[PDB]
Design a protein around this ligand. Structure first.
Ligand code: GPP
Ligand code: GPP
Ligand code: GPP
Ligand code: MG
Ligand code: MG
Ligand code: MN
Ligand code: MN
Lengths: 327, 344
């Protein structure tokens, strides 16, 4: 993203904190509002805000050039921060399920941070025609993300992976509901609504390509968890018994002997068991299978983007595609 | 509540479960929608649904008599179930946070096989679900956005209450310097009074197309006063109630809760009595709970509660008489009549 784009986006964050914790209200509960300021400051604005900045870029590429005022680009930035509040709530839920001090999280902090995005939406968007579509989008994406988290959990029982559950159909459903809706659909649909693009067929056209990009994003992430260079963090998907693309394709390709290695060694704490699974992935040619998928999926997605109709700009989707595939 | 009111309200619940789990959506993930039906069935419909039924009663007393149709009373019932969905989400999370054993005689959801900390996802899922119910039944009505905004605002405020409650503890040990009547009043207001008292009445007002900010303000003032008495009565009965009639053995002392009893005990205590609270309050040993209970008796908290109950009843009744605009006084007298001198 541009130096200008990053600086104007980051400049919004302190306002959102004041809006949620000060707002010149002279609160009767300053101790807990000061704590909530720290929860927001310590968890929301740090590292890459790729979903938030992607909301701004989406809007800038969908809106009429004449309507790209500083005021409208700032509203796009505020929507991006609502996406980052959602992201923060989900990472807090992950931190809590993993497991006072600086960086302490309360169990209800994830519910509280999630709820806060609706206060931001009400403050800035309640008088604009895009308001109800935007709040309904957040409601629907929230519900779908929760269903994705539950589907992922239904691949584990008594701390053991249920390998009978590791199908490509279930995997595709987990990625779609748990990740693709809030990561890929939400930023683009927000940009479209702020640009007063309400046509359901336009949103459906964007959705089809964004779910395809989302699936490759997660498959690449899964591949690199096992086969990536740590010095470019250490992957724990095998140890944690995750429903990974690697595990799903391993089970498709496995003979009975190879399947029994997965049953015995997948989702075990012992480092030796991780190396046994990695050795099986190498034997089954999962790297070559990933290489073929990467090429074939790139070509199909590029084709669908070139074919994008309903008055949608293809360059927006190419920018996203190029970002994920690193063309 | 009438036999009719209870049965018509209960008839709505299975429709809401179908709306959220069997309405032709998410056909690729039936195992999730089937599980979510079980989450709703366990956590939402087995209580007294006092907040849900109170939404219907509020609406019936606020709406113009000639406007009360079976169709509009059903919409009030659906809003009542949305309150019960919010409450279910909050209590799923609170039971995990407090590591509680039971809730309304049922094992806490987080204790059920293969849930534990996944109760966090179920909490967020149940809370998110009420906005899908609002969309289906209210999207075409003027009250739609005010009701959405009220639910999100009450969720935010309830979280401020829960987090303020947590700031009365340091790593599972009560901070007795934090146990002031000011902090107690703030915890009750934010953590329980907004969702329990303000939310049902404000929903009734919005469905009756009552949007006057001053009406909502006057309603809030009296409902926060009633809400404080209700929680003080609840706190008193945790220690001094009969387990067989309350339907629960009280563990507030064991849990180190910022209860009205603990707050008033500290106000009334000499330094020796303060030392007993410092040493024994919030301890797991049954002997420590008995020592605190015995100190509450020594300090005359039963007599103190009886005086508070009579004085606060009189003060709130006076305030309801002074309510202006066109708010029905009878709504607030009906709440008081239900609440005052209760033993459960
Ligand atoms: C709509 C879009 C494009 C959203 C995707 C958000 C996302 C997590 C991308 C990863 O890129 P990154 O630059 O944050 O990560 P890395 O440094 O690993 O490439
Ligand atoms: C606006 C009004 C008057 C709301 C009703 C408040 C109330 C008395 C709740 C009691 O709930 P409960 O202890 O019966 O619990 P539950 O209904 O959850 O079982
Ligand atoms: C944001 C969240 C999760 C809010 C929880 C709200 C609530 C009503 C908790 C119960 O309070 P308690 O723990 O003091 O009482 P009990 O469990 O005894 O009902
Ligand atoms: Mg990963
Ligand atoms: Mg109690
Ligand atoms: Mn509790
Ligand atoms: Mn609690």
């Amino acid at each position: 993203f541009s130096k200008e784009e990053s600086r104007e986006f980051m400049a919004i964050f302190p306002d959102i904190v004041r809006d949620l914790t000060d707002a010149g209200r002279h609160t009767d509960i300053p101790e807990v509002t000061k704590r909530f300021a720290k929860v927001l400051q310590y968890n929301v604005p740090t590292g890459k805000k790729t979903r938030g900045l992607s909301t701004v870029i989406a809007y800038k590429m969908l809106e009429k050039p004449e309507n790209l005022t500083p005021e409208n680009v700032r509203l796009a930035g505020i929507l991006g921060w609502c996406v980052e509040l959602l992201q923060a709530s989900l990472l807090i839920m992950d931190d809590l399920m993993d497991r006072e001090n600086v960086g302490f999280l309360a169990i209800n902090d994830c519910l509280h941070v999630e709820s806060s995005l609706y206060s931001v939406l009400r403050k800035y968007f309640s008088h604009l025609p895009c308001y109800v579509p935007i709040i309904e989008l957040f409601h629907d994406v929230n519900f779908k993300t929760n269903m994705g988290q539950s589907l992922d959990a239904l691949c584990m029982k008594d701390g053991r992976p249920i390998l009978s559950q590791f199908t490509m159909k279930r995997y595709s459903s987990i990625v779609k509901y748990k990740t693709s809706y809030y990561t890929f659909q939400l930023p683009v649909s927000l940009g479209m609504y702020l640009a007063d693009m309400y046509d359901p067929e336009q949103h459906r056209q964007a959705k089809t390509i964004l779910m395809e990009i989302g699936e490759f994003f997660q498959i690449q992430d899964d591949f690199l968890d096992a086969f990536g260079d740590s010095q470019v963090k250490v992957g724990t998907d095998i140890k944690e018994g995750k429903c990974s693309w690697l595990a799903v394709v391993a089970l498709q390709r496995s003979n009975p002997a190879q399947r029994q290695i997965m049953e015995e060694h997948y989702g075990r704490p012992e480092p030796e068991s991780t190396q046994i699974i990695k050795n099986l992935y190498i034997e089954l040619g999962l790297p070559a299978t990933f290489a073929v998928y990467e090429e074939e999926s790139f070509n199909i997605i590029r084709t669908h983007i070139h074919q994008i109709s309903k008055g949608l700009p293809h360059d927006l989707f190419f920018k996203i595609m190029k970002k994920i595939y690193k063309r």
